[PDB]
């Protein structure tokens, strides 16, 4: 009585059910929920001004546009030798704070979040946030398993160390930074 | 048969030359001006961790919030970037101003001892991009010609 | 001594000019934008007699592109043999070169408009880009898998950015790129498709293409980048040929649509037609990113709202705008013998012809000229529209039947076998989209065609055009929620689902999906 | 023609951070606050 052929529902139906076997990361006949694609589709500002690449994630940051900035601040052909070298245990808190947030998918977000993790800086896996402890502030409870104390959180959207004194899991802490000894690693390629 | 043989030859040919590429697909940094002090160097970062920076992480205000050694490391560091003029930007707002000879910035820590229509001599405050650190100085004299 | 009829001693004399200028590039106070070098390097270029003849000036031109391209295959083979050098340090060599060349083409090009010239200051904007193009082609050739996009990359991108901080010349600039990118495209140079997706989809690109464009002129010459896009893209989807390679670059397609989709719905509204005869009609995703598109600043009303009279909405009566001129596929003879159907309705040898003319079975695996059907579709119910609103009176599910236009969709629905049906049914579904006259049109055509239908299989493939279209993740088109919300309410429908629904008791689950997927 | 030969052939026609922080060093007196 059916469409016996690929054209009616059957054909459909099969579709559908050769998802569940197929391995790929495009199944054209069920589609991708395209809110997950790391784009922001509700944005009332326009999309392409920050726009990165078709296989990127997360959008232009500040220092990858490039702006015609007046000649004078073009500093580096004139004090790159004289110039400081990059050493994160030199620097203070709060530009760790925004080399980590800035930096992010990057080896320098971890460059940073060490340095923080050898200054007592210990990130929440859970509430994804810093956490120390306040000067002399030591816990009210303690045990092994936890400590209930004053803690300095480092809240980014208004860009300041914060006190909030509530319970702390040290399983939900993250341990010693890790480094991705990963070569010619590309982002694009795996998407 | 085969399905992948319903693609001619030249559509084969085009899907193995596409396959090699992916190989060596474009690098964020292929398209974009070098980077001297801070290059991409894309890794595998945990899901738990920030992947992305706040929202509105780009306005002058966000700067403004800021440390100036921040500022100051966005100058030099991020050479000809909107970060960079968005840090001069927030720094000059924050009463700093940058000196066009000497390559730094320079903020008054007293009123000058002396203003004329070609320079003010002072005590200032500045940033030594070498030694990596805010400096005092005494009797600094700041031409205009220098300034802006 | 080269491939090329080049005079003797003329790559060594080019490899040591630009060899040169790459350390000028890099020196210190060589100019802000290298102008204190650049004006002394001309010098010695013209002592060294390159500057002579134009046919030089081109040959020095394709030999430090052809250095460039060797500097990146040797700095990527010491990073491959090598795999305790740094891979950074490497791209950086690369950029070193790249980016010393690009500032020498772009300050000859701006240094080349004499007395503030237009004509000679693009001639050799389009010769270097030509230069270029050729280089990468040969390389893409010969090289094979072992060809780099690199450098091409670089040296495209860094021009465009280069030759972007003159209105008019801006235009006739991006007029160059454009011209070299479809020569690229990747049916031409398919080892350079990511680079490629990534030079047409580039920030600045769509931005002076699409936004800060005059009387949006950039506008039908984007659209045609995104169809050479589509027609690579096709064979490969419509084979279910999906490999990881070709996953990435349908995701990086999604990514860029979704940005127009976005950004320049108005864009991706008046080039619907022209996408949709290329996207194949397994894309149901794809093309209703396409198809969901509708004029910014438009109200439209919820699908599901209860006790919805669409005929109310004034925009039911205004037709959309179509940038494609469609009725091109048609055959002189064809169309003549259609509308000659369509005011006579003589003679009835025009049906039964009809489906013999939509076929094509001389070209291998498709058997039907679906360009062709999408043209006859449109074209069809255009003129019933138009005919209808001579009459006096407007597209209704009454005004519609018994029209000579009708016959025509009446019969291909009986006529046509399941191949034939799906793909016509698919052309009217293209049409279902936001308030409109077609949208109103074939969604009243496609529910008189699933009322009137005689035979279950039509009322089948009705069924499977509109539902798997609907079962796919988000956009769906208006109209297409519209048209289904009311055919399920059809007692014609009802019958059907319970006959069905029993055969195969599997169905029932997809119809659920559509009442969460969408509400 | 070579049109853009010649626009370019009379083009042609046409046509230290050391020292400074060293004096630098002179200019006023350096201190730590």
Sequence with gaps: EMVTDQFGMIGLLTFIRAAETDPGMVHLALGSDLTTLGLNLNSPENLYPKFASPWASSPCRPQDIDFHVPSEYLTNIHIRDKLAAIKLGRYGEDLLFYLYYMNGGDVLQLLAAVELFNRDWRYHKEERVWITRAPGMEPTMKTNTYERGTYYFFDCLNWRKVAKEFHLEYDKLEERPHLPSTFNYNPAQQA | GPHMLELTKEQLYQQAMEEAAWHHMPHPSDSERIRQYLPRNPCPTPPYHHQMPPPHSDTVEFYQRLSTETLFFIFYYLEGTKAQYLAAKALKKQSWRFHTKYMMWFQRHEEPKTITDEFEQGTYIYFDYEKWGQRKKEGFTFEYRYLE | ?519 | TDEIARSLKIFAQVTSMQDVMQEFATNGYASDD
């Design chain 3, 1 to 519: 001594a080269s491939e090329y009829d080049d005079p003797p001693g003329l790559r060594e004399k080019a490899e040591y000019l630009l060899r040169e200028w790459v350390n000028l590039y890099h020196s210190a106070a060589a100019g802000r934008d290298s102008t204190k070098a650049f004006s002394a390097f001309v010098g010695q270029m013209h002592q060294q007699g390159i500057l002579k003849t134009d046919d030089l000036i081109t040959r020095f031109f394709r030999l430090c592109t052809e250095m460039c391209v060797e500097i990146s295959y040797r700095a990527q083979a010491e990073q491959q043999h090598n795999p305790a050098a740094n891979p950074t340090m490497i791209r950086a060599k690369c950029y070193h070169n790249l980016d010393a060349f690009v500032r020498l083409i772009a300050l000859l090009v701006k240094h080349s408009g004499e007395a503030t010239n237009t004509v000679t200051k693009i001639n050799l904007l389009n010769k270097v880009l030509g230069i270029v193009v050729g280089v990468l082609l040969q390389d893409h050739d010969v090289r094979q898998s072992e060809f780099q996009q690199l450098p091409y990359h670089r040296i495209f991108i860094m021009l465009l950015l280069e030759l972007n901080a003159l209105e008019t010349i801006n235009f006739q600039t991006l007029t160059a790129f454009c011209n070299t990118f479809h020569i690229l495209r990747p049916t031409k140079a398919p080892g350079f498709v990511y680079a490629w997706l990534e030079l047409i989809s580039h920030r600045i690109f769509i931005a002076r293409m699409l936004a800060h464009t005059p009387q949006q002129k950039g506008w039908p010459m984007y659209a045609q980048l995104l169809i050479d896009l589509f027609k690579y893209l096709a064979p490969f989807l419509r084979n279910v040929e999906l490999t990881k390679p070709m996953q990435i670059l349908y995701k990086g397609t999604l990514r860029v649509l979704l940005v127009l989709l976005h950004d320049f719905p108005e864009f991706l509204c008046d080039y619907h037609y022209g996408f949709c005869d290329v996207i194949p009609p397994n894309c149901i995703q794809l093309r209703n990113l396409i198809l969901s598109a509708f004029p910014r600043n438009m109200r439209l009303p919820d699908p599901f709202t209860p006790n919805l009279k669409v005929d109310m909405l004034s925009e039911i009566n205004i037709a959309p705008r179509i940038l494609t001129n469609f009725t091109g596929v048609m055959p002189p003879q064809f169309k003549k013998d259609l509308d000659s159907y369509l005011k006579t309705r003589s003679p009835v040898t025009f049906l039964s012809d009809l489906r013999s003319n939509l076929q094509v079975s001389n070209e291998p695996g498709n058997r039907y000229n679906l360009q062709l059907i999408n043209a006859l579709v449109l074209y069809v119910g255009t003129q019933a529209i138009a005919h209808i609103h001579n009459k006096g009176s407007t597209p209704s599910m009454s005004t519609i039947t018994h029209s000579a236009h009708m016959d025509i969709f009446q019969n291909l629905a009986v006529d046509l076998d399941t191949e034939g049906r799906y793909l016509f049914l698919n052309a009217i579904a293209n049409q279902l989209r936001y308030p409109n006259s077609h949208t109103h049109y074939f969604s009243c055509t496609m529910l008189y065609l699933f009322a009137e239908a005689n035979t279950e299989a039509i009322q089948e493939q009705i069924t499977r055009v509109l539902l798997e279209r609907l079962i796919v993740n988000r956009p769906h088109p208006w109209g297409l929620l519209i048209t289904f919300i009311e055919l399920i309410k059809n007692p014609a429908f009802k019958f059907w689902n319970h006959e069905f629904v029993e055969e195969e008791p599997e169905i029932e689950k997809l119809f659920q999906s559509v009442a969460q997927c969408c509400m």
